[PDB]
Amino acid sequence: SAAMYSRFVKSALDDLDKNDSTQIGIIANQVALPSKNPERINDKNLNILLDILSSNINRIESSRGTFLIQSIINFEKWWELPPHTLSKYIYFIKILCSSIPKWWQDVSMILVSCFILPIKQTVCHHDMLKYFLRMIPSSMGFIDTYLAKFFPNKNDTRRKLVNYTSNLLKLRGYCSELGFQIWSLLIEKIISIDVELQNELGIKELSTKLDSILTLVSTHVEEQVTPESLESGEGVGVFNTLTTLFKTHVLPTYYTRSIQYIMFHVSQQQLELMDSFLVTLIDISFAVNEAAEKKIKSLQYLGSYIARAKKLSRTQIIFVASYLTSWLNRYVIEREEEVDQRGGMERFKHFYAAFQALCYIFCFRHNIFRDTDGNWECELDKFFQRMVISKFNPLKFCNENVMLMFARIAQQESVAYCFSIIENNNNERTRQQFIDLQSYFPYDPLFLKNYKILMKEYYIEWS
Amino acid sequence: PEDFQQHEQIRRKTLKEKAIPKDQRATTPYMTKYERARILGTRALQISMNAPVFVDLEGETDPLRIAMKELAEKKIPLVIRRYLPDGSFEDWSVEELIVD
Amino acid sequence: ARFIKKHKKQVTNPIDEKNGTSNCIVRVPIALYVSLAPMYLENPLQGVMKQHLNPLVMKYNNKVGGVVLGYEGLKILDADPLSKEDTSEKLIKITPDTPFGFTWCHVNLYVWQPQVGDVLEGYIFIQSASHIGLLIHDAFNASIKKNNIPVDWTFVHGHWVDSNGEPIDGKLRFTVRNVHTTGRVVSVDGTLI
Amino acid sequence: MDISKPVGSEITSVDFGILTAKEIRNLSAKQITNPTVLDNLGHPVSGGLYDLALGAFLRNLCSTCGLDEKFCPGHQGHIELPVPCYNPLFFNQLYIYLRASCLFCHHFRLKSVEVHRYACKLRLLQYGLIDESYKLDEITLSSTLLNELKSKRSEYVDMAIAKALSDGRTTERGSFTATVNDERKKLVHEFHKKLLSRGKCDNCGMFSPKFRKDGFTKIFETALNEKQITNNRVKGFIRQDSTYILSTEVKNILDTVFRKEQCVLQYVFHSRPNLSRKLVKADSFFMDVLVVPPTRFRLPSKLGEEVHENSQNQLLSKVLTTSLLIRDLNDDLSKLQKDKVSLEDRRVIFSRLMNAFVTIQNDVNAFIDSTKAQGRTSGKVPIPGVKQALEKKEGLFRKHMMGKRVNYAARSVISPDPNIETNEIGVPPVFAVKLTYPEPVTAYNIAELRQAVINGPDKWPGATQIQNEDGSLVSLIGMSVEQRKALANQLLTPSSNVSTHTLNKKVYRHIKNRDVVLMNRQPTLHKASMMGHKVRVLPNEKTLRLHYANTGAYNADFDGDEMNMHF
Amino acid sequence: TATTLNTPVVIHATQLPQHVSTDEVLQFLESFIDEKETNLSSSISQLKRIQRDFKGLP
Amino acid sequence: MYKTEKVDLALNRNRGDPITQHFGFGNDEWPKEWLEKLDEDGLPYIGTYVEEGDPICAYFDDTLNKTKIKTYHSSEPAYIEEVNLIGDESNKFQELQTVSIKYRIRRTPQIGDKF
Amino acid sequence: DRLLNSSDYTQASVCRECGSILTTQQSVPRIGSISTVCCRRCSMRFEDAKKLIFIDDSQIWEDGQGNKFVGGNETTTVAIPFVLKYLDSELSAMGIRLRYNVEPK
Amino acid sequence: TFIRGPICGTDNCPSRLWRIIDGRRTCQYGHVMEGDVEFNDDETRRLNLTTNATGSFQSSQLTNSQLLQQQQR
Amino acid sequence: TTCQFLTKAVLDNEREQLDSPSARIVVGKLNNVGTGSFDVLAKVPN
Ligand SMILES: [Mg+2]
Ligand SMILES: [Zn+2]
Ligand SMILES: [Zn+2]
Ligand SMILES: [Zn+2]
Ligand SMILES: [Zn+2]
């Protein structure tokens, strides 16, 4: 035992030199037993086995010792040993996977697959990865496949999803070179649970499945981006990979509202972010190369964001609304001769959706528009009356419910007259993917619970 | 490596020998109906797998009706290689064939 | 009569001067028959790098023999053999059944290739009782095992101590014994004796 | 087939050849020895005809590559043979070169310059030069005379070859045309008739004996004549410097001939220039081993609810049992001493092996063919072999390779309809539900593929499958409306990868009023009876509806005629 | 794993390789990472650690 | 159009074996919408409306301990007109090994019906 | 479409040296990297390779019997019907091979 | 109406791999098994094989061993 | 008769060149008559 069992494995290693290897094969069957089984090798017997191997790894680099290594690395619940055998099992892996650097790809399949446990049980998993992903630097590549291979399913347990999400956000914390693929993993997967929920507006499972995952991203990212990480760190990097995945993933998908709320959370950390998040929503709502369905869908992201963003000033908000009113004024210069032409009203559906943003901003920020002097912004009387007397007629072809609320707060201030043309509507008496598109506001009140509690920092109500 | 380079000098010299130059193309100046069907076949297979389209769609949704339209303005960027039974060929572009 | 000796590393690696070490970085010009997607029909140079040359950066590929660093000078061979080199509209053969274009290429790959018998000098990042862990050029992993350590060298708690009684650290010169390339990671088996 | 996975390699030419004995023993996995096929448990024997190195079987894994029965390609094994055997297809070309060899001179019984003439005609006819092969008769003027005739003939062949390569008249890989292919069939028909019309050996004067055959590859060597031994013994000074004959001695003379007859038999078995210089060997007529097919091409034949043995397993069984009667009787004469054996005991073993050396050969002849084996069990409609599945009207080439069966096709009764166009067809709503078409997702059809996924598999216009960016199908059959709308909003969402960053999702939409079908009516006489119509999907019926203007082309009469329809 | 959308079907070495000295390696390594600035990032990160090593900065 | 199928389990029995499977319901779990179409001896109710997927008999095995099922195979929706309990002409063997079901199929004059 | 795409259409694999579709198999892996496709006919036994310079590491593979091999790694994939693969089986019983030429070389 | 089997060859399930969506097998949540097709033979020495599942062949008529002999006594 | 044309072709080592429309159905290429009588190349800029 104290001297015989050390000579027993030494007489097992001696038979390795003579190509026999059966007492290795029996003792390999001894190691790889379950931890819950009392037939296993105990703790003080594991101490004898590991220092005789860590003394000389340079004998078992053979084709007949590959079950001996495989029995060691598949130690079921290896991290739950006592910390005097744990510190030698850990020290064995830091010698095996550096002396023989072909064995790292097998244990890294285990250290990533066992991240379905909570963070307080895999504290020694994350210490080893930050060691080897700087010391085997070429292993930075293929572990990206290992991250995405073992991600649990959207109809798997609530246990496995939140323990796997939180363990990955630990791996985000120190490997800044990976960066993109972790945020590309979750935002591709949280969107796969979100499009179920908007149709519910298996509810009780799928609702409580995502809000735990969607909180654990938002509480993590409000810690990751900070005022001392913009001017001095890489919080400009956390913003850009969050705003380039909003453009590529959340724009082209349809009929979703729980995921753009993470950009209702990161953007409110500072003021230059909300300028840059605004200039993100500007140059995609007006670039001429895209199809209209991206310039229509992003204009609904313009109207329902500025109406609900808590931190704003006329030095941004009116100054884009001055140019928006010039963008409408330059739209009524060229194409008000193209309203009697041979053609339909569909040519200005970009305009009515542009005008829709103004009757949504007016319903939520009208008390902001009053200056000190008592005059409106940018000749509202020369604007709100002028656009409706044209042949464009933006009351008929725009929304029915969110613009009728504007015509009550229009004639609470009498800034324009539009009810006689409503009396003209009932006097005078391809599109279905657009007709059900302007009835879609992104930042409407959330149906979840916990993320609404996190949103009393900067989300406003209808009141 | 040199036995590949010595191999490659044969394959390029043969294809230069087989190719009939542009001034001596003695085949027909028309688009035979087996050539028109494959041009609208391949161009509709590229529009379907996200190629850049050179026209304005006017609400078409079928990728055959787009490539039929794009031949009507001679915008199709393909090149027909009309084989002769010795091995030779004559690169006729689509823009220089009289479609009927 | 019959030879399978065409896996021989035809270019031996020199020893750098003035130094004691080698040079193992070469430039080999390859040709390769690639595919091309129907979305890169307006940027075919950009589309070949984004699809076939970027997955070869900093990995192993046995046809060039070592580790590919990077590339320079991608020229798509033209399918019209009467044009010149100065043309800017090249032709690419489209498959019959599928719309995927297939083509040839010419490109220069800068390879770092070590061989058996060369001298390499690299850093030490772990000293154990059975090996010395080594990085070469801060990218590639190496090891000098116990049986290749000379018998007049000692260990202490730790770090290895040489014949005269000093610790060894950092740039430890050695010669190559084997290059293991089985898994997804290169492995240089070194030897000090 | 899928248009997102392209192939890059193309097959251009299929050279032929003969599988050799050193070739099969390399590529094979597990030599089949045991004559049985299963043990008592219901499991395959490690060394039998269902071995788990020849293909994954019931639930196991194939021991060579380690994949399931739905991923294993299969592998082929081999049976050993102690006797070589007669190949029952390469028999008559062995039978001809048997009856033309000289058993004493080790050459052919023809001349030495007549054979060299037919070689130099056949070499020029490889390169297509039909003229210079015919001008070789124009070269004619003892000991050094025949080495001057052979010298200028080989110079004239070499002069004509290098002259015909200076221009593009021929190339080194050799031309071959149906006119050049004609003259080769006239020389070889003449070179084989001239070899079978010999008496005395015209090289060294001896007299070779006779051979005579049976259909079961039984050949009997006839002994000589008194007049011909009289010529043999008196010509025993110049050359001074009906028993059933078995297989191995016939092998031993033919390697001796084919080593000496290279420069003429090089060109008999080569219609093209030999660029590999693979020398002809006489082993190419004898089946030393036997390649059994993989287990997946030898599955048992279910009939109703019972399971019978595979019919090719029976013909491979009887080879393996009879190879154990000989392999015991091979070691029987060797373990027993060769001085203890009498003149009777050597003659009673040699009346047991000579009965079993026949029945090993009359089973290779039964495994390959059924006509060229014995008449067994009074007719019985016997067990078909390998050649019998590669044959006439119901064979392999005329039932499974020239005319196949198709996916995405329907057939029903036709009925008249004047209210559609002449170029249309009325698809009823029972075909407009099962027939699909992979229509990929781009920006112009995403308005319509969302509406076609939400509609589900049982509402026209609808769809019945999705397909992700990595080939992974997702059906829509059991899904409810909130799960189909969960997938309909996710068609254009990019799935992040580096391999499939180009491809996109194909939706298996239903058939529409836009598509085109390909009607057909058997019997199809002329090419205008397989036309192509545009679909018009009608409600409330079960028959295909056709206009009367197309009943001139299909010769259709509307009383029970049925027409196919492809897609 | 690897279809023919991310794999060449052949790669053939045309010439014999030429041993390049370090001063032109540093010129190539400089001019390569400038032009390469999505999955290229984790390869060119490791390349940035190589070019610092050749000039010599631990 | 009438049509008769003979539900049988006296086959594959190897000439001397015990009655391996029996008709009738078992005692473990079985999905209980089998009771909507089968009576309590493993025979269908006379006059029911069968489709492709409905059961026609529920034989409880013994060597697999499970309440098995047998299903209607043709895709045409048929009724059930008569069920006969055929007994053995030889000695006892008396666990009802041969049953004969007759399905009645409606045929209304459609489009494509010859006259 | 009616005779290749919509009946069988198996993308098989060929060797680019011996030119056969039936003697290719997936090598079982070593230590546990990715698996690769290898050919039996072009390959040698590994101990025979040590009898005739050091053998490269990346050109060794093993079947599911543990036996090592060298070579047989030059292979690509082509698109054939399946009845060709049945025919190449049936012709090899009669002793006939069908060597293919697969371009590009 | 289902049939138990593996989980799935992807991480995107657990399921009991239900029966045949016509031609191939399917999991509960949609994913068609990639890839195997149902075989059939449409047209001596009788063997002990009981092919039932999807046209593939199964084993002989010995069950789990002692239960047929413990319950018989 | 399939065996007869087979045994002549193996004894000659005849390379089939895949030109008939019955040979290209066996191997599985595209036919030569009709629309399979030319090649379609693409014209990419730069
Ligand atoms: Mg009729
Ligand atoms: Zn296998
Ligand atoms: Zn002689
Ligand atoms: Zn091969
Ligand atoms: Zn599944």
Numbering used by the authors:
A (entry chain O): 48 to 248, 324 to 551, 581 to 614
B (entry chain F): 55 to 154
C (entry chain G): 14 to 170, 215 to 250
D (entry chain A): 1 to 141, 174 to 273, 312 to 637
E (entry chain D): 12 to 48, 80 to 100
F (entry chain B): 803 to 917
G (entry chain B): 1090 to 1141, 1151 to 1203
H (entry chain Q): 3 to 45, 57 to 86
What does the paper say about this structure?
UAF was assembled on a dsDNA promoter scaffold ranging from position −155 to +8 relative to the TSS together with TBP, CF, and a fragment of the protein Net1. A final cryo-EM reconstruction exhibits an overall resolution of 3.5 Å and shows a Pol I early intermediate PIC (eiPIC). Upstream DNA is well-ordered between CF-interacting regions and entry into the Pol I active center cleft. Following the canonical DNA-path further downstream, however, no density is visible around the active center itself, but ≥12 well-defined base-pairs can be placed on the downstream edge between bridge helix and the clamp-head/jaw domains, even though our scaffold should not extend this far. The twh and linker domains of subunit A49 are detached in the eiPIC, agreeing with a proposed role in promoter escape. Within the eiPIC structure, re-arrangements between CF module I and II enable Rrn7 and Rrn11 to bind promoter DNA, mainly by phosphate backbone interactions of basic loops. In the eiPIC, the sandwich region tightly holds the promoter in place between the wall and protrusion domains at the bottom of the cleft. sandwich elements contact both DNA strands, therefore rendering it specific for an un-melted duplex. The TFIIB-related ‘reader’ and ‘linker’ elements within Rrn744,46 are mostly ordered in the active center cleft of the eiPIC, with the exception of the residues 46–56 (B-reader homologous). Assuming its active orientation in the eiPIC, Asp629 now allows coordination of the catalytic magnesium ion (‘metal A’), together with Asp627 and Asp631 for which we observe a clear cryo-EM density peak. We also observe, that the Pol I cleft continues to contract downstream of the sandwich region, adapting an intermediate conformation between the Rrn3-bound and ITC/actively elongating states.
